[PDB]
Design a protein around this ligand. Structure first.
Ligand SMILES: Nc1ncnc2c1ncn2[C@@H]1O[C@H](COP(=O)(O)OP(=O)(O)O)[C@@H](O)[C@H]1O
Ligand SMILES: [Mg+2]
Length: 382
């Protein structure tokens, strides 16, 4: 009831914050000038880095750079999802009373935090970004969560807010927030079916909502928890490792530093390919002392990922199946997640839906935060 509440999207790879400032929702850019900040936290001898600064030093400090906390939040150390994921994280995950705790080293001192504490740090960064832009203290907010999150996961998220000093007015589902973003919540005096296609950094979520009277009903969901942007980056990486080996006769595969730098260059090239037909990869002193100057073409990129792009439609086909609906019954198709900006993914979706127009006027990566910001405003007054 003082200072507008903010809408915060807390994603597994990137987070975003927006505020309904008098009439419109303005999505707040950070200190580095980005509209989304990695959900990365890093611990060094002299400091605690959050956001871009953390992600930008990962290759150097892998064991003390935390990410993927959302895959742990509200879970028990003993569950199979945790057990499986742990086998691919550079950081340490320990067990405390059946609860996972990320073990790290901060200033020589060994520490460990609960997933909700890692997330609250990301939340503090968003709140900072907001307060910076507005020139006032931000207390109230609406935080989003996946539709499949159970009661434990939802509480852990609320707690993350409380720790960060936030008054969580409400916790809403991500697909619902995307729908509100486009005003699909307005009462049209009829039942409406909407398909949210969310392809972000590490997960793929497909949801079919049914809206009537402004009341949402998640009729079905599908997707893959280990399918996202990073999978595309990795295919390019494997492609360049082989080319470097060809041109230089030496395999850099096992150099954890070279690989992470290449990977960083690839993800940057991938972003460019969404708007251009080719991009250049210039990495000084890639392996030992050799500079890796080269380029990729959009055509080659799609080719390296063809199988992954097509597979994307199976979960969709299944979503329809479970909701007992046919393609023709979908009123609106909303694109969400930074990966839906890839031209070939959009094509594949339209083709499947026989030309239907996709909702994509709001950056797909900012859609969830956009919806949460509208929601927050209405739950306030101004
Ligand atoms: N222009 C772009 N083209 C392709 N991928 C992009 C683009 N912009 C962002 N991305 C990707 O979006 C992913 C992040 O998606 P986002 O929806 O912001 O993440 P999250 O799944 O964490 O919510 C990353 O893989 C990033 O590379
Ligand atoms: Mg997301």
């Amino acid at each position: 009831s003082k200072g507008p509440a903010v809408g915060i999207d807390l994603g597994t790879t990137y987070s975003c914050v927006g505020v309904f400032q008098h009439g419109k929702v303005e999505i707040i850019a950070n200190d580095q000038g980005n509209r989304t900040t990695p959900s990365y936290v890093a611990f060094t001898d002299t400091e605690r880095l959050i956001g871009d600064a953390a992600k930008n030093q990962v290759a150097m400090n892998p064991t003390n750079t935390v990410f993927d906390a959302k895959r742990l939040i509200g879970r028990r150390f003993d569950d199979a999802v945790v057990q499986s994921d742990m086998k691919h994280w550079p950081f340490m995950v320990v067990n405390d009373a059946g609860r996972p705790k990320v073990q790290v080293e901060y200033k020589g001192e060994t520490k460990s935090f609960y997933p909700e504490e890692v997330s609250s740090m990301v939340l503090t960064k968003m709140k900072e970004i907001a307060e910076a832009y507005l020139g006032k203290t931000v207390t109230n907010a609406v935080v989003t969560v996946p539709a499949y999150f159970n009661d434990s996961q939802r509480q852990a998220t609320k707690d993350a807010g409380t720790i960060a000093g936030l008054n969580v007015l409400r916790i809403i589902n991500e697909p619902t927030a995307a729908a509100i973003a486009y005003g699909l919540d307005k009462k049209v005096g009829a039942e409406r079916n909407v398909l949210i296609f969310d392809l972000g950094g590490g997960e793929f979520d497909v949801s079919i909502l049914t809206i009537e009277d402004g009341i949402f009903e998640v009729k079905s969901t599908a997707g893959d928890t280990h399918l996202g942007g990073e999978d595309f980056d990795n295919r390019m990486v494997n492609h360049f490792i082989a080319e470097f080996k060809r041109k230089h006769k030496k395999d850099i595969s096992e150099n954890k530093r070279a690989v992470r730098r290449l990977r960083t260059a690839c993800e940057r090239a991938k972003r460019t390919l969404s708007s251009s037909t080719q991009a250049s990869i210039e990495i000084d002193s890639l392996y030992e002392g050799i500079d890796f100057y080269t380029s990729i073409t959009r055509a080659r990129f799609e080719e390296l990922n063809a199988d992954l792009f097509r597979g994307t439609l199976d979960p969709v086909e299944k979503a329809l199946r479970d909701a007992k609906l046919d393609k023709s019954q979908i009123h609106d198709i909303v694109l969400v997640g930074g990966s839906t900006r890839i031209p070939k993914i959009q094509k594949l979706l339209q083709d499947f839906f026989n030309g239907k127009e996709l909702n994509k006027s709001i950056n797909p990566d900012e859609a969830v935060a956009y919806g949460a910001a509208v929601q927050a405003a209405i739950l306030s007054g101004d």
